Amino acid sequence: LLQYHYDCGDFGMQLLAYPTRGRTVHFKVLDEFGTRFEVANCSICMHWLNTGEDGGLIFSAGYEGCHVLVKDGRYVLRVQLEEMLLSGVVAASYEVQMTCPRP
Amino acid sequence: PALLQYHYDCGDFGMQLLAYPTRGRTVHFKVLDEFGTRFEVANCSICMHWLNTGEDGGLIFSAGYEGCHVLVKDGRYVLRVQLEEMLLSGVVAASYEVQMTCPRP
Ligand SMILES: *[C@@H]1O[C@H](CO)[C@@H](O)[C@H](O)[C@H]1NC(C)=O
Ligand SMILES: *[C@@H]1O[C@H](CO)[C@@H](O)[C@H](O)[C@H]1NC(C)=O
Ligand SMILES: [Zn+2]
Ligand SMILES: [Zn+2]
Ligand SMILES: [Zn+2]
Ligand SMILES: [Zn+2]
Ligand SMILES: [Zn+2]
Ligand SMILES: [Zn+2]
Ligand SMILES: [Zn+2]
Ligand SMILES: [Zn+2]
Ligand SMILES: [Zn+2]
């Protein structure tokens, strides 16, 4: 159902999500112990949430952020997407693993 | 007519971006990341960027060198900023892109 796409850059990674009409998405970052971290506007962790000129939600994460790990020579970040109805119910949950090369 | 006067200064722990809008206009600052995303600037002490209006009409955007949007490129702190010259109604009269590099090349 949910459409999403992520890009690797030089200093960070970007995840674009386009939820169904009249739905919304909740972002949580996952550490290796399953904790879910809410993304906030002003924080030390070098991750952000924004809404584009279209209905899409942009998640930015710097490679040197909090929960970005190095595993087998690649930056890896796990993010959970909560597609949600206007009543507040979770319609679906998606887990995405963002992999990006590194020296 | 896009004649906004602005300049940036490099300091010891951060840099300052000064804009002097004319005719009762104001400026909103947005940081640009490498993916073209725009982050509007609000007071955030943990990200080390602040907004001020001097005793004169100038609008000040301060950014600490170790702030979260700030990158190191060729041994220099680099921040790419969009200036939105705005009327008090909220409309953007003009947009300027400035790349703040410190220390100066
Ligand atoms: C950041 O703040 C803006 C307005 O200041 C708000 O619209 C947005 O939802 C906030 N982002 C969050 C809470 O993740
Ligand atoms: C924002 O931060 C600056 C610098 O610390 C301060 O002068 C100002 O009062 C703060 N609040 C605003 C602009 O609302
Ligand atoms: Zn892409
Ligand atoms: Zn591609
Ligand atoms: Zn939630
Ligand atoms: Zn993070
Ligand atoms: Zn100056
Ligand atoms: Zn000094
Ligand atoms: Zn604005
Ligand atoms: Zn910020
Ligand atoms: Zn704008």
Residue numbers in the entry:
A (entry chain B): 25 to 127
B (entry chain A): 23 to 127
Lines from the paper:
Vertebrate oocytes are surrounded by a specialised extracellular coat that is referred to as zona pellucida in mammals (ZP) and vitelline envelope in non-mammals (VE). Although their fine morphological appearance differs between classes, all vertebrate egg coats consist of filaments made up of a variable number of glycoprotein components that polymerise using a common ZP module. Accordingly, a recombinant construct corresponding to the predicted ZP-N1 domain of cZP1 (cZP1-N1) is secreted both as a monomeric and a disulphide-bonded dimer, whereas a protein encompassing the trefoil domain and C-terminal ZP module of cZP1 (cZP1L600-R958) does not form intermolecular disulphides. Thus, by recapitulating the oligomeric status of full-length cZP1, cZP1-N1 harbours its cross-linking function.
